Structures are given as structure tokens and as C-alpha cells.
């Protein structure tokens, strides 16, 4: 499949879809999550009744905060990728004030919500999710793409219990090393913190932080102010909970490696060093890709458009100025 996936990505990358719908065709039901440049809300298509998740971004704040190329890459890359664990973009448009990205609604909620309400996942439960992340990272790296925001708040469980990755806000074609300081402080790799110039190896570091937080219930490095979290990330020492496996401690010691000349995924053997680790000995990678494994946890679905698995946010009406702002900056959107 990876052989045919490269041509399809480049086909959708150069001939992207733009302006496929408008705001008047969508009823707005409930907010699913609030970011820094906008919000995501559950949305119902009036003519077809189908439900969707609409990510709204204010154009002025994006231009003001130097985020133009980041948002341009978000829409273009997500529109061009196709993998059984990536969220699918369905519509995209814009008006005088906002940009709109309409994705497929994932009613199961964030993995962060279920992680906090349960405490932690057992090792086989956490291994079942990491296998999907490993397969997705192998796919995205085949296309020379980077995903610089792996965290449970960006991972949604679906109705089959499988992971759907969202939030492509920092995704970028990286043919070599990039330099942008971005991500989530708990999951930043040391080379990002020190402005050293990083490659695809940062995704594997973020995978080690994720496997840690799932199997323990808390991240390996956290503190009040983010400055102290950076101090713990670059220190090189990481302490493990006592109930952790020897097989899991070994894998995390290779993923949470500061020296990226000895970090798994960045070595000569690539993703095979991870998939062939002892901790993944009981993992049928083909069955996970084909989604033929009974999920350990399946969220409750009270019907279509059910928002139970999401938190309640302060609802705010969507309002557009009567003056178009930053029209020339978002031509390619």
C-alpha cells in the first residue's frame, strides 16, 4: 500500500480542493473544543442531515501571529493524506473573517478525556493505541511529512475503538531539517527546545512521551511553569513508575533518548527498530492496519450527533465582519 500511497499524495497536493461549501449550509449545534486561533464545533449539514466537525480560524490572528504558512500547510496536507487512522477532510471554505475546515465527526471523544477519567491504560491497552500511531508515523514519513503535535488531546477514539488523528496545524513537508519552535511543552523533543534543527526524529520522541502518559497516567516531564519542563526534558534523566514492564522501560529508554544518533526511528533500520521491539512481540501489524482486531475499549454512542464524550464549553455564536480581512494572504486556501 505504501508503494501506491506516494503518488496519490502528490496528486492531491498539487491540485487541492478549495471552496467546496459555505457557512449557510451548516447548522451549528455544540462546540467540541477551543484552541488559540478559533474553535471546533459539531455541525449538521442541512440538506443531508450528516454531522461534521467544523474547525474555525480567525484570519486576522493568523496573519498577526505569523501563522499563515502553518495554516496553509494544515489544509493542504490533511486534504492530501489518506490513512485509516487520519481524520478525513470533507469541506473547506472561508468568508470575510474566518477560515473553515469541515472534518468527519468522531463522536468517541479525545483520548485525553478517557485517559483522565480512567487514570491510566493497561499495557496491552496502551500497546493497541501505540501500534496505530507507529503505523501512521511510518505512513507520514514515507511522504516526507512531519507531525509536530502528538498528544492525547489530538487523538480521537472512534466508534470502532480505533484512533483518529486530527489537528494538522504543525504538519509540514520536511525534506531535511526544519527549525520552527512549535508543539506542546510536555511533548517537545530536546532538539526543538535548544533551537538545534530537527528532523522526523521528534515524532518518535513524542511517541515515547505518549506511551509513558498512557501506561502511567501522567507525562514523564511536567511542572508548573513550562521553563521547568524544558529543564527536565533536556536533562537526560527519566524515572519510570515501578509497575512498568522491563520490556516497556527498554522501549521508552530508546524513544526518550536525548542523543538522536541513538534514538529509535532515527537509526539505520528506521521503524523496524520499533515494530520489532520485544514490547511489540504480540502485535499483528497487518491486522491493526486492516482494523481487524477487537478494540479493548469502545466508547458509548447514544446516537448520531451525540456530544456526550466531549466536555462542555462556553457556547459563542459565530460572527463575521462585513469587511473582508486579509483577502490576499489566503488566496491558496
Amino acid at each position: 500500500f505504501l508503494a501506491k500511497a506516494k503518488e496519490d499524495f502528490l496528486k492531491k497536493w498539487e491540485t487541492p480542493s478549495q471552496n467546496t461549501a459555505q457557512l449557510d449550509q451548516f447548522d451549528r449545534i455544540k462546540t467540541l473544543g477551543t484552541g488559540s486561533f478559533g474553535r471546533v464545533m459539531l455541525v449538521k449539514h442541512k440538506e443531508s442531515g450528516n454531522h461534521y466537525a467544523m474547525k474555525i480560524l480567525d484570519k486576522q490572528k493568523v496573519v498577526k501571529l505569523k501563522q499563515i504558512e502553518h495554516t496553509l500547510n494544515e489544509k493542504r496536507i490533511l486534504q492530501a493524506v489518506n490513512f485509516p487512522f487520519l481524520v478525513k477532510l470533507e469541506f473547506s471554505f472561508k468568508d470575510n473573517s474566518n477560515l473553515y475546515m469541515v472534518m468527519e465527526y468522531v463522536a468517541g471523544g479525545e483520548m485525553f478525556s478517557h485517559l483522565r477519567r480512567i487514570g491510566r491504560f493497561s499495557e496491552p491497552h496502551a500497546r493497541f493505541y501505540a501500534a496505530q500511531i507507529v503505523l501512521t508515523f511510518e505512513y507520514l514519513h514515507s511522504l516526507d511529512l512531519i507531525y509536530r503535535d502528538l498528544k492525547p488531546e489530538n487523538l480521537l477514539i472512534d466508534q470502532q475503538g480505533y484512533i483518529q488523528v486530527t489537528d494538522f496545524g504543525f504538519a509540514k513537508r520536511v525534506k531535511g531539517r526544519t527549525w520552527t519552535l512549535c508543539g506542546t511543552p510536555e511533548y517537545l523533543a530536546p532538539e526543538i527546545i535548544l533551537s538545534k534543527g530537527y528532523n522526523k526524529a521528534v515524532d518518535w520522541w513524542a511517541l515515547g512521551v505518549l506511551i509513558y502518559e498512557m501506561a502511567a497516567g501522567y507525562p514523564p516531564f511536567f511542572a508548573d511553569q513550562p521553563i521547568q519542563i524544558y529543564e527536565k526534558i533536556v536533562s537526560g534523566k527519566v524515572r519510570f513508575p515501578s509497575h512498568f514492564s522491563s520490556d516497556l522501560k527498554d522501549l521508552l529508554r530508546n524513544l526518550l533518548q536525548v542523543d538522536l544518533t541513538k534514538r529509535f526511528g532515527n537509526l539505520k533500520n528506521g521503524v523496524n527498530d520499533i515494530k520489532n521491539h520485544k514490547w511489540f512481540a504480540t502485535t499483528d501489524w497487518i491486522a491493526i492496519y486492516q482494523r481487524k482486531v477487537e478494540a479493548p475499549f469502545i466508547p458509548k454512542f447514544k446516537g448520531p450527533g451525540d456530544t456526550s464524550n466531549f466536555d462542555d464549553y462556553e457556547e459563542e455564536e459565530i460572527r463575521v465582519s462585513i469587511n473582508e480581512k486579509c483577502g490576499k494572504e489566503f488566496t491558496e486556501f
Binding site: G33, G35, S36, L65, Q67, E110, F112, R116, D149, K151, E153, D167, G169, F170, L181, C182, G183, T184, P185, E186, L188, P226
Partner: peptide, 9 residues
Amino acid sequence: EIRRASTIE
């Protein structure tokens, strides 16, 4: 505890 927001600077 609280949804960690991504950083840009």
C-alpha cells in the same frame, strides 16, 4: 488535568 494547549513561541 487540563487540556494542554500547543505552543508557538
